[PDB]
Every structure is written in C-alpha cells, then in structure tokens.
Amino acid sequence: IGWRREGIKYRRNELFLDVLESVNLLMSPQGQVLSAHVSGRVVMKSYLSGMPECKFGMNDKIVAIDDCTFHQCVRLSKFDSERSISFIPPDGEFELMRYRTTKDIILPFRVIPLVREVGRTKLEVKVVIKSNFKPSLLAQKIEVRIPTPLNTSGVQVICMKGKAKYKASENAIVWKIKRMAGMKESQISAEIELLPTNDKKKWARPPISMNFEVPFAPSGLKVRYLKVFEPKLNYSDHDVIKWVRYIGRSGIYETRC
C-alpha cells in the first residue's frame, strides 16, 4: 500500500476528525428557498502506530448525499456497508471524503428584510436576523452586508446587538455580531438620504449576504464512530484517543430584498 510507510511508532495513539461544511442559500424576499447546498469534507489527522485498519461510521448513507468522493485508501465496509467506510489511512493529515447535499439542510439564519420609500429623498432599510439552531450553541463571526443605492448621501443606523457602519466605498451597511445563541433574533434599522440622480431605473437591489460560523454541520451529518484494529501491535479502540469537531461556515448565503 503506497500511501503509508511501514514502521510508524508513536508514544500516544491519537486522532482528530474535522467535519467542515459551507452552507449556501438564495432566499426570496418573502422567505422562499430558491437554492441551497452544503459543500462538505471530513479531514482526518492521525498519529497511529503501525498499519491500523480504521472504520469510519456516520449517521447516514455515505456509500442524503451526492458528488461524494473518497481518498484512494477508502474501501467498502464488511458490516454497516452503507453508513461506514474502511481504510488504512495515510499518517498525519489527509482529506477522507468530500461531498454535497441539497436535501434537509439546516439554514442557521433567517434574514427578514423591509425596505420603505419615505418620499423621494429617503429610504428606510430594516433587517431582522433569527438564529435557527439549539439555544445551547453559539454562532460567531456574524456579518450582515446590506446594499445601499448608488445615490446614497448620508446614512443613520442603529442595531439591537453588535455594531454597524455604512461603508460608502462598498455601497453597503456592514453589521457585525461577535456571538449569538440559537433561537434568538436581532434587528438593524437604517435611514438612507438619497441625492438626485439621472438614473431613471428603480434601484435593482443586490441581495443581503451573511457570514457566520456555527459549531455543527448544516447537512445534519454526525460522526458515530472511528474503530481501529492493529493486528500486529494489538492495540484497539480504548488505547486510541479520539476527537471530533464540527465547523459550519457560510458560503454564498444571500436573501433578496
């Protein structure tokens, strides 16, 4: 087997499984999903003595997922042949699997916009965000980007959580929240002063976009087990120290306004 040399020895048999997902959304102004996908990977970092045979089990068929591809080390499992895979891994860090889902995605945030024209020289822009996940969990690095018209002169804006700023060079209001628990909501309200323009066309509103990080896979995928068998060194599962981390991030996470 080409990807792992013989004679590897470690004082401490240990492995790390990193479940990393990007959640993508195009939502209507009224809250209809126009498109959504998760792109995901499992990265394994292992320091295991010898030539261990490993079996990776998940909560769902991997052998509600698509475009699923595996490292060259990956083989069919004997038992749980639909929810697990079996392999002798490369030493150190490698990508075990890469996948796409479209079905049953957790959309961690709902963005609810309201734009009101107050006369000809004033725009009111208001956005509510709602965290849609367990209240015991925290989202972090939250950013809401709200487009402004090209004929914006002045902006006044306040928000019920975090901080917001108008960036004239980007034609956007940028709203930052350091952390937000599941099943919470916040609001931003802006008043935008408009200058006279020769533009005859009504503002073609870019979508409102978000960045965020969440400590769960938006696909719903969960690691159930990583079993290890080293036939020659005769260590097994209880001998190996095993960790899992889930990081869900926004990809292109857009809501039309």
Binding site: V223, K227, W243, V244
Partner: peptide
C-alpha cells in the same frame, strides 16, 4: 480554540 473538540468515546 480547543473547547470545540469533542471526545469520541468507544
């Protein structure tokens, strides 16, 4: 941050 790592017991 190391608090995001969960144990896999078994």
């Amino acid at each position: 941050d190391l608090l995001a790592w969960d144990p896999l017991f078994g």
